[PDB]
Design a protein around this ligand. Structure first.
Ligand SMILES: Nc1ncnc2c1ncn2[C@@H]1O[C@H](C[C@@H](N)CC[C@H](N)C(=O)O)[C@@H](O)[C@H]1O
Length: 326
């Protein structure tokens, strides 16, 4: 669909009656280091992407009884769970994370994150982009729209997290590599990835039920979790609703991620360990995933100003989303 101006997109923001709504208050404000054992996380694994990593099609568990790939899938599953058993018993891969909840309000396309409930001093701003093509029957979405506008005077909140399958991932993979054991190098990396993603799923449930606490009686099966049958989202920088990777630096500062977990950011703002997930938490019932997609020069320049960056800098970080030749 054809581009619209930045002002036209903002005039089509998510429509919601904030005066009639009470955002749920975060029960546990502040930052908390967390850990999770392999025994705990293995009940939150989504196995279907594991089999995709091994080039097998089909959803788990039905893939195990498949007529052509089932026997191979069963052997992969057995080797995977034997390796989880060993990693668990030997404590050689140790998932870690950190979670935080903060007072927050929307201003424009950004989310102000406050030091405290006086909502004066801003400790960080979470910057977001807005869809910028002609939308029929939908808002031009921006993740900031899911937090109450500061002008509404409603007390709202935002969360953030960072989790990893464990800092030991490289040492375990590198040992298999030195042995020319490609199978087990792929296996331990695929397991660390499942453990990181399982930790993201588990911690999000902890946030909905307890840390934020807006869904204390939620009782979903793992299959229902995989289907996202809960209220709220956990969008991650680099994914289509928030594609701009340098916002991971804001999460790293907000949560003191490196101090609490050992996890690091590269110059490309990739996470280390490789098996890592970081992102935000939104509680709003209408919050959903979508793609920002292609944006125009006016929004690039505005984003640069808000970020304290030059236009040239931002055109690097936003290159995949530029709707024009830079
Ligand atoms: N459009 C989007 N914008 C932002 N984050 C997204 C988007 N789509 C997916 N995500 C993120 O990706 C997650 C979904 C999956 N990657 C992870 C769970 C899945 N069961 C798996 O193991 O692959 C979401 O919970 C978000 O953190």
């Amino acid at each position: 669909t054809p581009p619209v101006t930045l002002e036209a997109a903002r005039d089509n923001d998510f429509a919601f009656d904030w005066q009639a709504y009470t955002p749920p208050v975060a029960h546990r404000l502040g930052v908390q280091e967390v850990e999770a054992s392999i025994e705990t996380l293995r009940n939150y694994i989504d196995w279907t992407p594991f089999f995709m990593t091994w080039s097998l099609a089909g959803k788990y568990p039905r893939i195990l009884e498949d007529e052509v790939v089932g026997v191979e899938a069963q052997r992969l599953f057995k080797d995977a769970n034997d390796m989880l058993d060993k990693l668990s018993a030997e404590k050689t891969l140790n998932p870690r994370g950190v979670v935080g909840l903060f007072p927050a309000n929307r201003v424009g396309d950004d989310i102000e994150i406050y030091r405290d409930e006086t909502r004066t001093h801003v400790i960080n701003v979470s910057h977001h982009l807005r869809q910028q093509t002609e939308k029929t029957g939908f808002a031009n979405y921006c993740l900031a729209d899911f937090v109450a506008p500061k002008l509404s005077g409603k007390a709202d909140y935002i969360g953030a997290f960072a989790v990893t399958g464990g800092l030991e991932e490289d040492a375990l993979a590198d040992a298999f590599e030195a042995q020319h054991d490609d199978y087990n190098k792929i296996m331990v990396k695929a397991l660390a990835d499942r453990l990181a993603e399982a930790f993201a799923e588990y911690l999000h449930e902890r946030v909905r039920k307890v840390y934020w606490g807006y869904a204390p009686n939620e009782n979903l099966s793992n299959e229902e979790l995989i289907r996202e049958n809960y209220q709220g989202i956990r969008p991650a920088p680099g994914y289509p609703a928030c594609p701009e990777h340098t916002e991971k630096a804001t999460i790293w500062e907000l949560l003191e991620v490196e101090k609490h977990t050992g996890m690091k950011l590269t110059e490309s703002f990739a996470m280390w360990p490789g098996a890592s997930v970081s992102g935000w938490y939104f509680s709003h019932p209408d919050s959903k995933y979508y793609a920002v997609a292609q944006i125009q020069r006016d929004q690039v320049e505005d984003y640069a100003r808000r970020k304290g960056m030059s236009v040239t800098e931002v055109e690097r970080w936003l290159a995949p989303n530029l709707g024009y030749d830079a």
